[PDB]
Amino acid sequence: HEFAELFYRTYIVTPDQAGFQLSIRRNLVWEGWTGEGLSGEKQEISKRNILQGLLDYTTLETNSTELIPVIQSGENDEQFIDPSVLPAQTVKQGKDTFDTNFLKFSENGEGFNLLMLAQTPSRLKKGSMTFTDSLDSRIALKQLLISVTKGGTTELFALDVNRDQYAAYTATREYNFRLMQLKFHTSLGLGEESTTVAGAESALLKDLFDLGYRIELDVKVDGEMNVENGNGDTSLRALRLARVFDKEGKEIALTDSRVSAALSGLTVTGVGYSLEARLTNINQLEMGLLIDSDVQKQGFMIPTLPPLVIVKPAMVEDDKTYPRLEALTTAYRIQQMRNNAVTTLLNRADTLKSYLGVGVPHPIESNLGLEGVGQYYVRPYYNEATIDVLNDLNNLTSAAKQTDIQGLIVSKINEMVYTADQLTGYTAALEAAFSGRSPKPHVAIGTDMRLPQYIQINGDDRTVGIGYDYTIARISDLRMKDKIVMTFILPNESEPHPLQHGVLGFIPEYLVDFNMIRNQRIGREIRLTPRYRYFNFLPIMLVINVINLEEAIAQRTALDVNETQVTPAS
Amino acid sequence: HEFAELFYRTYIVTPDQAGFQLSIRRNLVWEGWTGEGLSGEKQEISKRNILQGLLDYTTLETNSTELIPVIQSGENDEQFIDPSVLPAQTVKQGKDTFDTNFLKFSENGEGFNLLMLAQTPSRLKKGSMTFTDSLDSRIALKQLLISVTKGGTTELFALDVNRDQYAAYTATREYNFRLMQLKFHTSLGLGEESTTVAGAESALLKDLFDLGYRIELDVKVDGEMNVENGNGDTSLRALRLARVFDKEGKEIALTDSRVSAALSGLTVTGVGYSLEARLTNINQLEMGLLIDSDVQKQGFMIPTLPPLVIVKPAMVEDDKTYPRLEALTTAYRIQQMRNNAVTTLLNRADTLKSYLGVGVPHPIESNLGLEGVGQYYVRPYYNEATIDVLNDLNNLTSAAKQTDIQGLIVSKINEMVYTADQLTGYTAALEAAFSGRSPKPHVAIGTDMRLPQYIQINGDDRTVGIGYDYTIARISDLRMKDKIVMTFILPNESEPHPLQHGVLGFIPEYLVDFNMIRNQRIGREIRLTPRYRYFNFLPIMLVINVINLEEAIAQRTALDVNETQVTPAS
Amino acid sequence: HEFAELFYRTYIVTPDQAGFQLSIRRNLVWEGWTGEGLSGEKQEISKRNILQGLLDYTTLETNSTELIPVIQSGENDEQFIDPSVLPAQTVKQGKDTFDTNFLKFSENGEGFNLLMLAQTPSRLKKGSMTFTDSLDSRIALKQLLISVTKGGTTELFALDVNRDQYAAYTATREYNFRLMQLKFHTSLGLGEESTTVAGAESALLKDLFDLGYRIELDVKVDGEMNVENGNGDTSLRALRLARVFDKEGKEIALTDSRVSAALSGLTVTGVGYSLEARLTNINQLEMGLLIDSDVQKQGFMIPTLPPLVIVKPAMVEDDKTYPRLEALTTAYRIQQMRNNAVTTLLNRADTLKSYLGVGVPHPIESNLGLEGVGQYYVRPYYNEATIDVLNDLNNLTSAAKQTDIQGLIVSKINEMVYTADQLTGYTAALEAAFSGRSPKPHVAIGTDMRLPQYIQINGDDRTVGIGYDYTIARISDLRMKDKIVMTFILPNESEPHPLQHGVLGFIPEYLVDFNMIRNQRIGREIRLTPRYRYFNFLPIMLVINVINLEEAIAQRTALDVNETQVTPAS
């Protein structure tokens, strides 16, 4: 029966075993483990799976290797700018908490060693780096800090210079092969919507900004650094206010009165900078986050079901007298394959109602009381809506009523399916589970013989299919009256997998021929014993219950006659 | 002529037979015969069609072989929970009625024999069981009843547990090869809307539920049972409150003031449980429902009809003077096919209206007075609706009338089609008719040659077939002026069948050439006497009576001049 | 996914080099160097890119071989018309300013030497010689200056004669092997829309023109020219009023009273004429615009990133037991591609917003502080718009609300894309870049899960593009919630190109196996150091911020009651 296979696919189970088991490969991200205490009770291991990383990014992030300058009281305060220019900043790295600040411009020729400044509390406990830690080929500046001062007022601009094709250190062989040199000569443009470090609007250049002007600073930076021992130095060579431009981009001279007043007594000066430094770790000293593999596996069972029976006299041949075969087959089909499936679907819907709540997502590894193993691959989610067609629409005419109902119902179904999809990330689960092919996720829609007049859109073939494929079903059961139950399935595959909506564990049972005495009357009989049961993996379901449809359609035949019988005029 | 065979398939019939007969092999499910008392009156055998099971699910279902704990007052109540906690409940299996209740959690180590803690009156009458039968491989917990006591107020919760796979007994031998144990190791959660046993929202957990909080209970249930002889045990091992969830999934401890108020002195203890267990019926102790085949027969006769005659002067050749039979063929075609088709169709329509009335469905096999054998498969149904085109609409402009009329007619016709198909279950019957392919049900639209400009809506790929296919036919008869006749037909088969709408039993006709002397005339004569008859099988028909359409058409020429003649402005 | 490579075409590079080096070529057109610094100050060679000529018509223009008369006091006054009738006109060719005026009909029969009147001051500086030159075969008159005078009022009509094919000089070698003939013998018409040289409408013919008549005169002008010698003469032979037309194209005689009064005493006199002459430039006298090629180059380098770790028992095989490699590959794929991709995309969007401003384009070549190389090819442009779903739309009854939302979204996206294309000139650069192929520019539109229900409109295949190709992708990050990102990409190419959007610099790294001691343990550390980078090229992005969408969606179910339960009427 068509409705059956669309939600539960036939998977033949051999009669030898009494069921089938499934294995789940769960991958998890380690954070740490139970150190030294003295309790004697449950110790808890902190575990999240990677699939949580599909929902957000911060759960899987590490910068253990990145070289970061670190400030210590009275040991390297000389090479950093004093906190009277900009207070210390807090940055979190690994398990340590430490403060950092912009490096001071060394103009006299004095050098600085980045490896000395790059000692964090984590690396100190490990010992001290000797000469093995090698700086990678990528070194660049985070920001250049330029000081705009006019009349004693100081404003700082954190200009991201890392986004430039002249801001990366380049190898250039002069003395040694491990020496990296820096050659930075661009025209840094300070815009008109830029803000200071704290975020406030700039006040020393507000007048030019109000006229729609942007100012060009010509910057000249020289530096060199050795990747073997980390010694080196950086110098500022030239920085001066170069040009002023209008809205469209015509040059305006510095001595012109349009910009002289705002730039009178205005000086630009370099203060500090940072470096994008990172260790090769040829010998490895860091660990970062760990990864673990665990399998949580569940068993599934194949019941038996109460038998069917046929009566027949024995002494004659059954070849051409009294029912053969087709009676039992039809009874089995109708009784067993359809009605039980509908009952299972309704029970599943109500079970989700009971356990999960309406419209409220739950994080992965949610309540385990839910049927199936879908909760290791996707957020559980259940939503319910009710549409009263009579309330939302008022039109006496019957001409376009049915089209309007189509529009309303399709609007509801598409909106709700996309909201559920975004809240669940099911597509993210499919695209993570398969590498090489990414079949388009499939939404199945089951309903009775009344709704399908409202899921179509005239002149259209994209009805619920905008980024998905659809397949609608039809069923005659009364409990399935005027309601739509929808969920996700996978067209391609036909064996158990934690993303199939449901699987029907089936075992075929054979015909049986025995002659049973009954009240001193012998009658040979044929017994057919069902063995099957519908199972449920995915804990996702969506139900639209359309009520009071009859009266709206009656309005087609209950209109107050708008009749106008006037004499023809031409 | 298209309108003819689109409704009746021309089934050839051999000239030797006087007609064709159909045998309809019917499947009937036995229920019971009344009158084994000695009275000597007609016994009435309650036979009901399985095909009626397409609509209802209570047609074929049983739970007789599955074992149910039966209360036997004064002998085995010790194994049951005291009904002072929960009153006894009655259930129905087969023709027996008995009261049931939850089995008590035995911590005192003495168990229960599930076989002998069962047996219905029917099983006792057939004979008390003697280890003739074993138990099924699948046994699982069905319901857990836990009592919530806080401040002297007790609330009972009937939790459905059968949808967790840790309650399904797992085969693991250590003593016998038929001994299975149970480990229930998970958490049970109570939602903000979980109804209690009384059938309403809670009153002690209402404070948490109203704020969107959920409570999780960790449950630790173990049990042992052997299918060999019904030996078994089950004990409660642990129960406490584990954690509390907010409306988002962040954990909140018991100590927190938001949840501590409603959990002070809150004690939860499980009191009882039920069992899902059943007999293997290897010995076939139990009788199932019965299916029998009965055969029905209908005979149809092919009659003779009035002749047609051409007079021809005789003593000359019959070849190239006076009609060479062309007039015979044309008259034969027209007279014997086209007029008779519409005659039979309209008479059948009024015949259906006479018996079934408007919009009144009938139960299956409830009428035998109607023509046809379709009553053995589908519900008889006849409906009638009239569209007053002018009175249902109000528009003046001539331009949009076409689209508006098209929309109205399509809406009404499609709604009628779907309502009729839902009320008849025709599609389910068609699906059950064949295995391996289910042709899409086909709707026939035969109407006069005025309307068809309205059944098609411009820009529609799917015109009237949203979940069906259609074929449009036209005829020039004056009787069908502004009328639509509808049914369901089978286009891909050409043979008689209970699901065929109608068939032309046709006989090839042999030309007769005898010379008859008529009033002393010696004239060559030719005879072409037809024999055929139109039949009806399916008692399904829908008629659309469109009246007053011409006036709404002329309303295009009846608008009251809307002119706007003003000087151009730009 | 698809989203990642859809915006950053993956490019593999050999692990032997720290990155890939890129070189581009530029074609610039030379005008002149602005300034000689006798103080030693720099010189600025004013260069502009040639592809700037795709959007303008002026920055590359040539006029250096036209032969244009030059007025000289006391040297050629008698060859020019009276300056009183028409003052001197200013004309620019090359870098010389001079005055030119029309040449009078030489009825005295003494000719002119064209190579004299058109010697430019550049040629005077170039030397003084006009006798190795040769005139091109193409000679034709620019304009005939006819004087419409009546009673002392003079009007001048600058009539473009170059667009009549009888004004082209034709070779008639009948006197010498280098003479060519001029015979312009036809009728020119002065329509109602005829405009004077100063730009005013006609005054003497205003009476007829207001009566919609058209006046055409027969022009009979003859002349000769010699290329080798420069000798030639052209004299007026016959000019006269000819005939009069009406609106319907029906000839009106000159003697008619309605026109005779306004045409008697009206004298039409030919004042001056000009010639189109071009030097064959067989002798190399003029250098056109000079264009030069200079090369710009940038180096793109790849970093190394923090590693991932697996802990593992060390005494046995690393192959067939315990956490395998698929854990590693899954962690790598989810972490290093996706998260860094979206981070880079968002950071680039905000960086472009910060430096460039909204709605203000910049000329070809601009501030260099933006990464990329397309700035050398196209105009930088950034624009962002915020659509307010709730405020912009007002619909109560659910039906076409979803359709209306699609209308909003499509309107915004189409207008943004097309306006950006016009202000950037992307398509011109694309077609200029490739010879032999020119795919229609492809627009990439990637967003989160919920919005694609509005990106396409129902009923068509051309969704977001009328002359473009598009690909819609979905991403699952929360950062990209309810926002749309747009830019241009090129699918066919798979290698770095100035018009490509961005490149995924990839270097594969092998995983290492060794022996490790960690905190006095013997374990296995399977290690992989990832190396990858995302580079930016095109400084063009379009961003849409969708807000209050949830309120408008709720407005579907927030409509007030609209119900009319009226009695049936027909």
JSON list of N, CA and C in Angstrom, two decimals, chain C residues 146-168:
[
{"chain": "C", "resi": 146, "resn": "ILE", "atom": "N", "xyz": [23.40, 77.82, -45.80]},
{"chain": "C", "resi": 146, "resn": "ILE", "atom": "CA", "xyz": [22.51, 78.56, -46.69]},
{"chain": "C", "resi": 146, "resn": "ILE", "atom": "C", "xyz": [21.83, 79.66, -45.89]},
{"chain": "C", "resi": 147, "resn": "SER", "atom": "N", "xyz": [21.81, 80.85, -46.46]},
{"chain": "C", "resi": 147, "resn": "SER", "atom": "CA", "xyz": [21.26, 82.03, -45.81]},
{"chain": "C", "resi": 147, "resn": "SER", "atom": "C", "xyz": [19.84, 82.26, -46.27]},
{"chain": "C", "resi": 148, "resn": "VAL", "atom": "N", "xyz": [18.89, 82.15, -45.35]},
{"chain": "C", "resi": 148, "resn": "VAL", "atom": "CA", "xyz": [17.49, 82.44, -45.60]},
{"chain": "C", "resi": 148, "resn": "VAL", "atom": "C", "xyz": [17.25, 83.89, -45.19]},
{"chain": "C", "resi": 149, "resn": "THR", "atom": "N", "xyz": [17.11, 84.76, -46.18]},
{"chain": "C", "resi": 149, "resn": "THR", "atom": "CA", "xyz": [16.95, 86.19, -45.94]},
{"chain": "C", "resi": 149, "resn": "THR", "atom": "C", "xyz": [15.68, 86.70, -46.60]},
{"chain": "C", "resi": 150, "resn": "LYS", "atom": "N", "xyz": [15.01, 87.62, -45.91]},
{"chain": "C", "resi": 150, "resn": "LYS", "atom": "CA", "xyz": [13.79, 88.24, -46.42]},
{"chain": "C", "resi": 150, "resn": "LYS", "atom": "C", "xyz": [13.60, 89.58, -45.73]},
{"chain": "C", "resi": 151, "resn": "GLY", "atom": "N", "xyz": [13.81, 90.66, -46.47]},
{"chain": "C", "resi": 151, "resn": "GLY", "atom": "CA", "xyz": [13.67, 91.99, -45.92]},
{"chain": "C", "resi": 151, "resn": "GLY", "atom": "C", "xyz": [14.78, 92.44, -44.99]},
{"chain": "C", "resi": 152, "resn": "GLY", "atom": "N", "xyz": [15.90, 91.72, -44.94]},
{"chain": "C", "resi": 152, "resn": "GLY", "atom": "CA", "xyz": [17.01, 92.09, -44.09]},
{"chain": "C", "resi": 152, "resn": "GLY", "atom": "C", "xyz": [17.26, 91.19, -42.90]},
{"chain": "C", "resi": 153, "resn": "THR", "atom": "N", "xyz": [16.42, 90.18, -42.67]},
{"chain": "C", "resi": 153, "resn": "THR", "atom": "CA", "xyz": [16.62, 89.26, -41.56]},
{"chain": "C", "resi": 153, "resn": "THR", "atom": "C", "xyz": [17.31, 88.00, -42.07]},
{"chain": "C", "resi": 154, "resn": "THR", "atom": "N", "xyz": [18.43, 87.64, -41.45]},
{"chain": "C", "resi": 154, "resn": "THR", "atom": "CA", "xyz": [19.27, 86.55, -41.91]},
{"chain": "C", "resi": 154, "resn": "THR", "atom": "C", "xyz": [19.24, 85.41, -40.90]},
{"chain": "C", "resi": 155, "resn": "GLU", "atom": "N", "xyz": [18.96, 84.20, -41.38]},
{"chain": "C", "resi": 155, "resn": "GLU", "atom": "CA", "xyz": [19.03, 82.99, -40.59]},
{"chain": "C", "resi": 155, "resn": "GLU", "atom": "C", "xyz": [20.01, 82.02, -41.23]},
{"chain": "C", "resi": 156, "resn": "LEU", "atom": "N", "xyz": [20.78, 81.33, -40.39]},
{"chain": "C", "resi": 156, "resn": "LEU", "atom": "CA", "xyz": [21.79, 80.39, -40.85]},
{"chain": "C", "resi": 156, "resn": "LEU", "atom": "C", "xyz": [21.41, 78.98, -40.43]},
{"chain": "C", "resi": 157, "resn": "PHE", "atom": "N", "xyz": [21.45, 78.05, -41.39]},
{"chain": "C", "resi": 157, "resn": "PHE", "atom": "CA", "xyz": [21.10, 76.66, -41.15]},
{"chain": "C", "resi": 157, "resn": "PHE", "atom": "C", "xyz": [22.34, 75.79, -41.32]},
{"chain": "C", "resi": 158, "resn": "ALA", "atom": "N", "xyz": [22.83, 75.25, -40.21]},
{"chain": "C", "resi": 158, "resn": "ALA", "atom": "CA", "xyz": [23.95, 74.32, -40.23]},
{"chain": "C", "resi": 158, "resn": "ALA", "atom": "C", "xyz": [23.42, 72.95, -40.60]},
{"chain": "C", "resi": 159, "resn": "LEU", "atom": "N", "xyz": [23.41, 72.64, -41.89]},
{"chain": "C", "resi": 159, "resn": "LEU", "atom": "CA", "xyz": [22.83, 71.41, -42.41]},
{"chain": "C", "resi": 159, "resn": "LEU", "atom": "C", "xyz": [23.92, 70.37, -42.62]},
{"chain": "C", "resi": 160, "resn": "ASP", "atom": "N", "xyz": [23.82, 69.25, -41.91]},
{"chain": "C", "resi": 160, "resn": "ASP", "atom": "CA", "xyz": [24.76, 68.16, -42.11]},
{"chain": "C", "resi": 160, "resn": "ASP", "atom": "C", "xyz": [24.52, 67.46, -43.45]},
{"chain": "C", "resi": 161, "resn": "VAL", "atom": "N", "xyz": [25.38, 67.76, -44.42]},
{"chain": "C", "resi": 161, "resn": "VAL", "atom": "CA", "xyz": [25.26, 67.22, -45.76]},
{"chain": "C", "resi": 161, "resn": "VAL", "atom": "C", "xyz": [26.01, 65.90, -45.90]},
{"chain": "C", "resi": 162, "resn": "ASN", "atom": "N", "xyz": [26.88, 65.58, -44.95]},
{"chain": "C", "resi": 162, "resn": "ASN", "atom": "CA", "xyz": [27.70, 64.38, -44.99]},
{"chain": "C", "resi": 162, "resn": "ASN", "atom": "C", "xyz": [26.87, 63.11, -45.03]},
{"chain": "C", "resi": 163, "resn": "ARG", "atom": "N", "xyz": [25.59, 63.19, -44.68]},
{"chain": "C", "resi": 163, "resn": "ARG", "atom": "CA", "xyz": [24.71, 62.04, -44.64]},
{"chain": "C", "resi": 163, "resn": "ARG", "atom": "C", "xyz": [23.85, 61.90, -45.89]},
{"chain": "C", "resi": 164, "resn": "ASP", "atom": "N", "xyz": [24.20, 62.58, -46.99]},
{"chain": "C", "resi": 164, "resn": "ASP", "atom": "CA", "xyz": [23.62, 62.30, -48.29]},
{"chain": "C", "resi": 164, "resn": "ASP", "atom": "C", "xyz": [24.71, 61.74, -49.19]},
{"chain": "C", "resi": 165, "resn": "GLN", "atom": "N", "xyz": [24.43, 60.60, -49.82]},
{"chain": "C", "resi": 165, "resn": "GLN", "atom": "CA", "xyz": [25.47, 59.87, -50.54]},
{"chain": "C", "resi": 165, "resn": "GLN", "atom": "C", "xyz": [25.96, 60.58, -51.79]},
{"chain": "C", "resi": 166, "resn": "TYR", "atom": "N", "xyz": [25.27, 61.61, -52.26]},
{"chain": "C", "resi": 166, "resn": "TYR", "atom": "CA", "xyz": [25.73, 62.39, -53.39]},
{"chain": "C", "resi": 166, "resn": "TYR", "atom": "C", "xyz": [26.71, 63.49, -53.00]},
{"chain": "C", "resi": 167, "resn": "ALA", "atom": "N", "xyz": [27.04, 63.60, -51.72]},
{"chain": "C", "resi": 167, "resn": "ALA", "atom": "CA", "xyz": [28.03, 64.56, -51.26]},
{"chain": "C", "resi": 167, "resn": "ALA", "atom": "C", "xyz": [29.43, 63.97, -51.19]},
{"chain": "C", "resi": 168, "resn": "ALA", "atom": "N", "xyz": [29.60, 62.73, -51.64]},
{"chain": "C", "resi": 168, "resn": "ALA", "atom": "CA", "xyz": [30.89, 62.06, -51.57]},
{"chain": "C", "resi": 168, "resn": "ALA", "atom": "C", "xyz": [31.64, 62.22, -52.88]}
]
